[PDB]
Amino acid sequence: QVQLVETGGGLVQPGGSLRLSCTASGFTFSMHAMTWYRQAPGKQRELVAVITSHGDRANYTDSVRGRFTISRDNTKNMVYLQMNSLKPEDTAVYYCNVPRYDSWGQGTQVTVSS
Numbered sequence: 001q002v003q004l005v006e007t008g009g010g011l012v013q014p015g016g017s018l019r020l021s022c023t024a025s026g027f028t029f030s031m032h033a034m035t036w037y038r039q040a041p042g043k044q045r046e047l048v049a050v051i052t053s054h055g056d057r058a059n060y061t062d063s064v065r066g067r068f069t070i071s072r073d074n075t076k077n078m079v080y081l082q083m084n085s086l087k088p089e090d091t092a093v094y095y096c097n098v099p100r101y102d103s104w105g106q107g108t109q110v111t112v113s114s
Contacts (some may be wrong), residue, residue: 002026002103004096009108012086020081020108022096029077035083035099036070038092038110049081050099063089086112 008020020036031053039045049057049070058070069082079096093107 002005002098002101004098004103004105006094006096006105009094009110011111011113013088013089013114014112016081016086016112018086018110020083020110021045021092022079022081022105024079024098027098027101030074033099034070034072035080035097037095037097037104038090039095040092043092045095047093050057051079053108083110086110090113 003025005023006020008018010018012018033053035050036048037045038048047061048052048064049058049060049068051070051072055072055074060068067085070079072079072089081094083090091111095107095110096105
């Protein structure tokens with residue numbers, strides 16, 4: 001079965017930084033586009049970033065552009081989300097997703113607060 005496991009969340013100050021990881025198994029990861037989504041309380045889930053199978057090109061939602069970077073390691077079968085210059089508005093559960101199947105992990109929590 002497709003399995004995605006996210007980690008790396010935490011509580012950080014405004015302006016701070018976290019690195020999220022997604023460990024993928026159960027599918028030919030190297031040949032799949034991957035995504036990160038997030039869902040904040042009282043809001044719908046939203047796509048944060050998408051990355052090509054090779055890892056060379058990415059698209060971002062407007063609110064995170066220039067601050068977040070999606071990347072991947074196809075040897076380790078991992079996707080990463082580097083979250084820099086964090087803001088309270090970024091507080092949410094962040095989910096790794098395989099768009100081919102709309103597969104989701106259980107998520108990791110990011111809280112940005114003073």
